[PDB]
Amino acid sequence: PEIVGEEHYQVARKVQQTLQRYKELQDIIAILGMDELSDEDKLVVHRARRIQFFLSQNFHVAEQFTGQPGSYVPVKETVRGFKEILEGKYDHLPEDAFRLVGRIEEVVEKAKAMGV
Amino acid sequence: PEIVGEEHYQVARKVQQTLQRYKELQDIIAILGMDELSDEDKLVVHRARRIQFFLSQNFHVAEQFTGQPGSYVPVKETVRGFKEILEGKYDHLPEDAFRLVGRIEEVVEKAKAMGV
Amino acid sequence: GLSVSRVGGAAQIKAMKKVAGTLRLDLAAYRELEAFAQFGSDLDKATQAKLARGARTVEVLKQDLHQPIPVE
Amino acid sequence: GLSVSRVGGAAQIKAMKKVAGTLRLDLAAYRELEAFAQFGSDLDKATQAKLARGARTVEVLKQDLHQPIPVE
Amino acid sequence: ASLRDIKTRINATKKTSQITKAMEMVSTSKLNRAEQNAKSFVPYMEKIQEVVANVALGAGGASHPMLVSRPVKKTGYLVITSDRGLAGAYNSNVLRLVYQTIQKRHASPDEYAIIVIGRVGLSFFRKRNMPVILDITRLPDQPSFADIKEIARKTVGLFADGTFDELYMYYNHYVSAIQQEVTERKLLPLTDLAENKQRTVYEFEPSQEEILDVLLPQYAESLIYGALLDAKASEHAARMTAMKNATDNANELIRTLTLSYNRARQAAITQEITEIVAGANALQ
Amino acid sequence: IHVSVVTPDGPVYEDDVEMVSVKAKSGELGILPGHIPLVAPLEISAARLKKGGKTQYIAVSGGFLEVRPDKVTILAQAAERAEDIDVLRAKAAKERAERRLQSQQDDIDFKRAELALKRAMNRLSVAE
Amino acid sequence: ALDYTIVVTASASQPAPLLFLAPYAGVAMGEYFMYKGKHVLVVYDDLSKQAAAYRELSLLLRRPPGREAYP
Amino acid sequence: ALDYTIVVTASASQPAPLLFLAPYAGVAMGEYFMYKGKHVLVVYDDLSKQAAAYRELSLLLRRPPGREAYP
Numbered sequence A, B: 001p002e003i004v005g006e007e008h009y010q011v012a013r014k015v016q017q018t019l020q021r022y023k024e025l026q027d028i029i030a031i032l033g034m035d036e037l038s039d040e041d042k043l044v045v046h047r048a049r050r051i052q053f054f055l056s057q058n059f060h061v062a063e064q065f066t067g068q069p070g071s072y073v074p075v076k077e078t079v080r081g082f083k084e085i086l087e088g089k090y091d092h093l094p095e096d097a098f099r100l101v102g103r104i105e106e107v108v109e110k111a112k113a114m115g116v
Numbered sequence C, D: 001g002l003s004v005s006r007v008g009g010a011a012q013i014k015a016m017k018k019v020a021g022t023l024r025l026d027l028a029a030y031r032e033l034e035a036f037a038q039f040g041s042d043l044d045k046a047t048q049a050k051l052a053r054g055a056r057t058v059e060v061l062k063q064d065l066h067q068p069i070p071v072e
Numbered sequence E: 001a002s003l004r005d006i007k008t009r010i011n012a013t014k015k016t017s018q019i020t021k022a023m024e025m026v027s028t029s030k031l032n033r034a035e036q037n038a039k040s041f042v043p044y045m046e047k048i049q050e051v052v053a054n055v056a057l058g059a060g061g062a063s064h065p066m067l068v069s070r071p072v073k074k075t076g077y078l079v080i081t082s083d084r085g086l087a088g089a090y091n092s093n094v095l096r097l098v099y100q101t102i103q104k105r106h107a108s109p110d111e112y113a114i115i116v117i118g119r120v121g122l123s124f125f126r127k128r129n130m131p132v133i134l135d136i137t138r139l140p141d142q143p144s145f146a147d148i149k150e151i152a153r154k155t156v157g158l159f160a161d162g163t164f165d166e167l168y169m170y171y172n173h174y175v176s177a178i179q180q181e182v183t184e185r186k187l188l189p190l191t192d193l194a195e196n197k198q199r200t201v202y203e204f205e206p207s208q209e210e211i212l213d214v215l216l217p218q219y220a221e222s223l224i225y226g227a228l229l230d231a232k233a234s235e236h237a238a239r240m241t242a243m244k245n246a247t248d249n250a251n252e253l254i255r256t257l258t259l260s261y262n263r264a265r266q267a268a269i270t271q272e273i274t275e276i277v278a279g280a281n282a283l284q
Numbered sequence F: 001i002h003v004s005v006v007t008p009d010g011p012v013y014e015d016d017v018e019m020v021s022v023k024a025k026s027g028e029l030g031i032l033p034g035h036i037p038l039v040a041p042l043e044i045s046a047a048r049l050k051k052g053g054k055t056q057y058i059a060v061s062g063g064f065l066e067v068r069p070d071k072v073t074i075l076a077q078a079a080e081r082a083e084d085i086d087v088l089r090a091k092a093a094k095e096r097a098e099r100r101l102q103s104q105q106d107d108i109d110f111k112r113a114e115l116a117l118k119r120a121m122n123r124l125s126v127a128e
Numbered sequence G, H: 001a002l003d004y005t006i007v008v009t010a011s012a013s014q015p016a017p018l019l020f021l022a023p024y025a026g027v028a029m030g031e032y033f034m035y036k037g038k039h040v041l042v043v044y045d046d047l048s049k050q051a052a053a054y055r056e057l058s059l060l061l062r063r064p065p066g067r068e069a070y071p
Helices: A006-024 A026-032 A042-054 A075-087 A105-114 B006-031 B041-054 B075-087 B104-114 C014-036 C045-060 D014-036 D048-060 E003-040 E042-056 E090-105 E119-127 E149-160 E209-281 F087-127 G016-036 G047-060 H016-034 H047-059
Strands: E075-080 E112-117 E167-173 E181-187 F020-024 F028-031 F038-048 F057-061 F064-067 F078-080
Touching: A006 A026, A006 A042, A006 A075, A026 C014, A026 F087, A042 A075, B006 B041, B006 B075, B006 E003, B006 E209, B006 F087, B041 B075, B075 B104, C014 C045, C014 F087, D014 D048, D014 E003, E003 E042, E003 E209, E003 F087, E042 E209, E042 F064, E075 E090, E075 E119, E075 E149, E075 E209, E090 E112, E090 E119, E090 E167, E090 E181, E090 E209, E112 E119, E112 E149, E149 E209, E167 E209, E181 E209, E209 F038, E209 F064, F057 F087, F078 F087, G016 G047, H016 H047
Parallel strands: E075 E112, E075 E167
Antiparallel strands: E167 E181, F020 F028, F020 F038, F038 F057, F038 F064, F057 F078
16 A cells, blocks of 8 residues: 555455455355355355456457457546445446446446446 | 277276276265265276276186186186176175186176175 | 367367357366266256266267368 | 464563463464354354454454554 | 375365364254254153053043054155265165165055155155155254144145055164164054053043044154154264264375375485486586 | 143243133133143143233144143143234244245255365365 | 664675675674674575575585585 | 304494495305205394495495485
């Protein structure tokens, strides 16, 4: 926190904690099933899917292969985006529209294009 | 198969297959025991004990070691004996009846002498 | 599972690529799910279908000696 | 558990010398049971009081950088 | 040979040893709670057995068919197994005993009927293609009377209809913590009931037959629930002993792997030191 | 006299009262201290015990009575301590839902532990 | 903390003898304050780097190597 | 037992050249009675000590060692 800042440090450590908790549930989900875990762990894997898809970007380099023009995302805006996904603001959006977006407003600009 | 015969070849490969499956089960048998295996692995162990004891043979040179006079087994008869072990024809005999035995009629004789 | 190709995908023809994708997916799935099937709980049907699929993949991927197959 | 101070105990202030002798035993009781706590509601207050006050011990002994705490 | 592989095998065996020791501690606690439930059932069981003795043994009273032996046309089998695995010889002994008694005396498929408790017995008698008529599986680790009450009422009613004509129980009697002897007890003929120390003559308020056909189903249900508390206690003790044996096997495996690790460690250091000194001597 | 409402699960009340009275399947009945050895089944109805002026009601279900002149020992397969007759049905429904949840809970707990053992012994097998 | 501490640096781009001589410079700066009567705290960050640089010096001077070529 | 036995002693404090030659001296003392028709029993207490002393005597001659540093 003395280097990156305090808010960035709490958001990054909470993202690491929820992705670690989703990593610990890999065999349970894969073998025993999805409908049997609990609540407050289905919420964990619920937010963890939206987190581990939002970490991906559309690159400027992949414009020649996919078509979408790419994005450069500042650090304050991705800290704000992961804070908003950790707080639960975007739990009603699907697990797509977090795939391959730059900013956090592009998530809702893609989800209004697909669905709700 | 073009040299040793197709029956010889597939009996030899099925013998190696059951011994390799039992070699994979060695760790589970060492720690957890035989009671966890799922009723086909119990059968594979139950056949592989018989195979790896029936590969042992009494020799003419080892008559001076133990007094047991020794045996000479033709190729078609050990193919027939291992096919009859793999078919399940000799599951009811004890596993110590197959040690140091030339051909499988002597397995039957030694198991009768043991008292099965 | 451990065998790596570093070109792979740029080597294959289009027809091999289309089906080798899903063959790699369900063979990796069977290699993962076979770990939980040597003893114990006798897994449910939802991945028993995947284990039967993967055993058929393993049985497809066998050959004889000196019998090469064309691409088609 | 692995760290040792072979002069230690006689290097401590007399205030810490009374208090650390309980803390060694508390954390040693917790780190044996730390891998036994993912599953099991085994004892009501015999070995879950150990897990509770050992987790509180581990939470006490954490710090941040550049903030040394005085001995009192 | 392959020092790093021996180290990873030591670490994997330590992880299995810790998992089996944690299962042993869990099973010790569940054995304690199963003994508490088996002890709390007992003051019901003495007084039910006392009332059944003083009523059915006083002045004849063989009118109810549960006290008399009818000619055997069929035979029921009540089998109490575990639902969850990782018990070594708990389920195997009971299922082999039931299978060998069935193959000994009947040798006809519709001459018997089997009532299993637990999924292990259910899978056994479905893989052997036997009639498995009642299926009360998915029971807790510490069961009450209320969830065994429905299948107990059904297996008393299937005698009262005239189907089973007698039935047997098969379960593991928890004797002391290491043995768990498999026992066969007999249900519904109640011919082998015993008298208590003090035989008292009760005064029967509606009739005697009404007392009997209310009480003797409850006596059979108390026998079934007592056998099931016995079998759950022997289940948790068997899994306790099985995980203790798995932990001891893992620990002696760790011991032999550390002997191999020390041999490979010394051989690795002497290999590296002679290769360094040979590369130094090549220049001089 | 000593009255003891006894369940197969465990004892319920087990104290001493003045005059216990309950309705059998034949009809009403009352028990004074020093009663004849009497045996009567019970209906699904409460059992009043009359501790002075309290009259603590105990709702038995299933139910069976044996009265000795000191050992009233009412044997009920379901029995609430503080009760009027309607509470046993809602209590049985609530405990049946709670015990179905408990059966699911401890089966899932065993399966979590067994997957931990399966993964660790897979890694032991891969380590060779 | 630079009212009372001394920092002695042998970074990795310097040759192996300065890496070798850093901790002995540490005690030689501390023993002055020790024999004057003060209390000193000397911190040797990564002595394994110092051992490896002394290994480098002993190997390039043709000295006979022991285990892991440490002299 | 000393009416027939002969004790050939090479200690732990003796140098490795005497440890190396103790079994050969025992055999050479037994062969005199063997080739005259007598029957000889020769006991070597810990030939692992002879092998370790010959490892010593070979490595001090700078012969390159093999498995477990034995020559």
